[PDB]
Design a protein around this ligand. Sequence first.
Ligand code: ICS
Ligand code: CLF
Ligand code: SF4
Ligand code: FES
Ligand code: FE
Lengths: 477, 121, 522, 130
Amino acid sequence: MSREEVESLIQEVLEVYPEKARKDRNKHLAVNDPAVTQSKKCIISNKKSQPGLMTIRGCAYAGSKGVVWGPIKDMIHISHGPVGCGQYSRAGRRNYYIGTTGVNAFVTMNFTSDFQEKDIVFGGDKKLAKLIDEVETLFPLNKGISVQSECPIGLIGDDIESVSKVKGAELSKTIVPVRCEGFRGVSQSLGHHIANDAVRDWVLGKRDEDTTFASTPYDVAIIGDYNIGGDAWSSRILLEEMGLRCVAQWSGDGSISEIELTPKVKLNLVHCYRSMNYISRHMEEKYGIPWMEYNFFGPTKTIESLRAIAAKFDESIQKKCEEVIAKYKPEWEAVVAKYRPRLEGKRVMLYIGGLRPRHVIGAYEDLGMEVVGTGYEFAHNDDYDRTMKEMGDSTLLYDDVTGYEFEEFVKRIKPDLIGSGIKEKFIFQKMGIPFREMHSWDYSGPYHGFDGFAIFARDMDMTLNNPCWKKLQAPWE
Amino acid sequence: ATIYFSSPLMPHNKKVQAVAGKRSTLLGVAQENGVKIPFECQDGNCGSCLVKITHLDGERIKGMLLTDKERNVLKSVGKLPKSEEERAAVRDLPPTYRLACQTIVTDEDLLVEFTGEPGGA
Amino acid sequence: SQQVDKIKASYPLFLDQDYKDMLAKKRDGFEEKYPQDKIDEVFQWTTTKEYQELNFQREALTVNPAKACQPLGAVLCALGFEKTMPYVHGSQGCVAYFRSYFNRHFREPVSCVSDSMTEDAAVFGGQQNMKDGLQNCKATYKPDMIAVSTTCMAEVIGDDLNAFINNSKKEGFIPDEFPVPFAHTPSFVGSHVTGWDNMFEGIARYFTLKSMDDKVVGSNKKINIVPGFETYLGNFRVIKRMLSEMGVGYSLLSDPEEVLDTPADGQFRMYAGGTTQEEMKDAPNALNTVLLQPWHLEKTKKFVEGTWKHEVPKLNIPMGLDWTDEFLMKVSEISGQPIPASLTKERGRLVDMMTDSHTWLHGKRFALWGDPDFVMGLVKFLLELGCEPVHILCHNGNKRWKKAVDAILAASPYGKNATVYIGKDLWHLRSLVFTDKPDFMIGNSYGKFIQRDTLHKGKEFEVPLIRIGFPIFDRHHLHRSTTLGYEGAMQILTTLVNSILERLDEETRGMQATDYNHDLVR
Amino acid sequence: LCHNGNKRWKKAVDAILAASPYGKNATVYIGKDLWHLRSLVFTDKPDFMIGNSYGKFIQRDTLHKGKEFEVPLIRIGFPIFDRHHLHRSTTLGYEGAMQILTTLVNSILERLDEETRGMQATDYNHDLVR
Ligand code: ICS
Ligand code: CLF
Ligand code: SF4
Ligand code: FES
Ligand SMILES: [Fe+3]
């Protein structure tokens, strides 16, 4: 409630900024009205960050190498450029996988050209070719190479596409040049776009002239699930228990063969719309594969998505879906009965990257919590279209929120729980407010499916109802 | 990247090979090949380098960032419909009309047409 | 399925039979995995010596490096001054990664800003970005100082900070008297320690270049201490305690001690402690300046010697027994204050612990890596303990550092089987520990994978890791440990000897097989 | 467990346990020896033991039942014989609480790292950041 209070709070918060910053940031803060269908008249998104305001956004290299290309396990990803970019993104994301690292899997290893002054002055194309040769000799079992370019690669004018073509022709290998320089784009969204374009242009159209793979009318491909803590595996077991066959996984625990076999799939199940809507649209336009968005956060959304997915097949799939729902009902009923009374009525504030602020709303509401403020770092206007309906009236919406803005909003609203990344966790824990990492699940998980809903409820009860929050003030103070 | 420059001033369209993603823009590629696109500033506000860019390979269209300076210049020229602005803002797809000094060459086949006049008739 | 009484996280939930069958079906059907015997053969090939010689023939590829880029060290140096905001002129991804790195290491908030240069800056430069960023940061976060570093993008573009800051001041974006020191910190030259050196030199030159006329050496009777790139709060604490217990008046420059350790009392302090600007202004008045890590403060040493006219002592890092003794003796010589009895008693206690644990510490082979000064101090301390450092690795070391370390090793009988590597990454170290097995490794969390690899060969080939260095992500509150000085030596000794005893206890635990050596008293 | 405890001490500990919701599954034993504790940890397995060096045998016993039944030991108390210079540690006050918290969390993390070090079997949880 208190919509006028929310607007006055926004106006008061915006007062510290200079005129340009205040005018720009006024467009990015909004009061939610669920009846609104077009977000363009209410909120503005996908714009550049105001300089010197401590934004939380990343770069295109983070969204391309660190998000999309990284989870692929049997390929080798070369961070073309200086050493820091690969170092800071090494194993910082919990995209789980199965394999023997260093022999046939390379997810948690850092390959880099390690550019020096002479590389900047003269170029690194010959160095790139030599590096590709050394990778081929040292890691024979790799099934592909992707070269993710950092800022100096595009800044000095290197031709990595020609090198990729020459080396791929010479060694009969799939070499994918990705122009994911950090300055390109305002956030990780352009990194997602560039990674999808690279997948489409260099990988997807490989098994087009063959038909050796035996297709099945129940063929589905998971798109946009990156196995953060094992989420993709829970979703996979839920789908296979329905009788469908999962051929591809994009890209958590994903393989180059699965990506190449994806065009032979009857239905695409897109979890992350923001990161992989481009390749899904391309697949629908080229191969005629329909794609549909689902939600596996909490029991209600999981059941609704399961029924929606079953509605696209014959009646046997529907009966199997009903069987699965009946089987898994008592588990989440018991979880709710155990944890809801401890968490009922609490107010939660969220700030995550994309499509997680709206997806986890159902999971929170399944335990009686209510979301009072949400927002995104790099979601576009269609994501806000989708998230307006799922949020209550007179709630706060923020896009590319700054540290000051988020701190003041939290101080005035005083929520009982905040779910965000590592760069705000220690800020908000010193203020005496429980915090959850909604990117890495606080090194827990998975949170997808009913198996993940149990862990989610346990984690929220653990963090929110902890004794340490009662002792933030000294007794003699 | 293969770029075909076309203009009523040029007797024949020229086919050139360019390195994608170069810091030098389409304007660098135009200058090094002798294509006379009228460049009349160095801060990217005049709009005289307006060109019409057609992606010949529709499948190989690369997403890009339309900077606010380019958007404002294109609006001041009039070569920016609201639909193309919405498409660029939501789907990160380039508009039909671009500025050569502010256009980064992508790895695709492009047709670049100019009339020899500054942007804005 | 899950039991509400016993809920399992990813481990061991994904060890269930249904999940195992799912994963097996997925691998058999769609992954096109190589046969397991072929994978085992390739792993065994990677273990052997011919793989090592193929490894060391690498000149263009780097696998698992151990070093960061300069702006990380620049930000760390900027964080050590009072009410100072680190400001990186370039892309925002750099700042996001720096903040994530320091957040995961220190588990404390880190404040840093950027001007978020985009394609517009790539084409037309980023002076407008710098102006708007300076104005916005000063208006919003209200710092007493903005310390400016650069990314690789701003270095390749050639964006010069001096003209940009001068224009931002002249056009009224920030007051003309607002202190805005800057430094050029390219990520393709050196490593993070070079960035720390560049940032400190930039700040010192900003404050002590136009006012050399009224400075006389020794007027304030103080000693300047430059800690360098330090990620252990215990080192700042021990330096302060050692100088305070002896009666020496000091002035620690660029100390992030207070800001990286702030109490949780219901409020968030964006700034805390730090070197005060009047301390930087009065720095040339000090008797002398001693550099705690001289091997990455070369440019700072040159500036101090040539402008402050201080005779900087040729001291080593105060690690171990002899080097701490030399540090204390040099400080006593400079300040004229004698060694107090407490320091002598602490040294005696350290020697007592050394003699107590020498029986377990003797003849143990260690492969270690880290920063140059930290690595050389650790090597010296290990040689002092009778240990044998067999593999010494430093990715960001030069040839002079290699010569100095080899000279240190050649002066002891325990450095005969010691080889120093510079420019080698952790894949080289994996090959080295596979072909010439040491008893332990000493390094940051990135070694935790190498141990894993060794465990794949067998329990008799596994090399345990000891987490000393930067960054440590898999353990909590290890950043509060001490490395320098006597107490740092005792902490390192305790860690080493207890790791040895833990390894021996783990090996000798099987009943009726090896538990005859499971002694109660060790 | 407290071998040299009395009845009033047992009542005090029961009172302090009832005041907190985490003491529901707690049982206080007085006059019992380490063989009773061996039986208790075999039949009602805890995650860790806390005590002097004499517990190292109990852990060994658990390892003989199986790796999944092993109960690792944390050496906090008197006497410690198989570890060097642990008598210099602190237990009272804020510094002692800090050291105890660090020891407990690091022991938990080392156990987790040991449990997930198997290549292609359990290394999917071998996280770099914990
Ligand atoms: S890809 Fe995106 S920031 Fe959609 S870059 Fe980011 S594993 Fe977030 S909100 Mo980290 S658009 Fe995935 C995401 Fe969401 S890395 Fe993960 S949690 S659902
Ligand atoms: S936005 Fe993105 S992450 Fe940033 S640099 Fe650019 S590609 Fe990379 Fe890596 S190396 Fe260090 S942190 Fe930067 S300053 Fe040069
Ligand atoms: S159209 Fe008219 S105003 Fe515009 S450039 Fe040509 S002559 Fe000048
Ligand atoms: S040259 Fe003037 S806008 Fe491009
Ligand atoms: Fe903390």
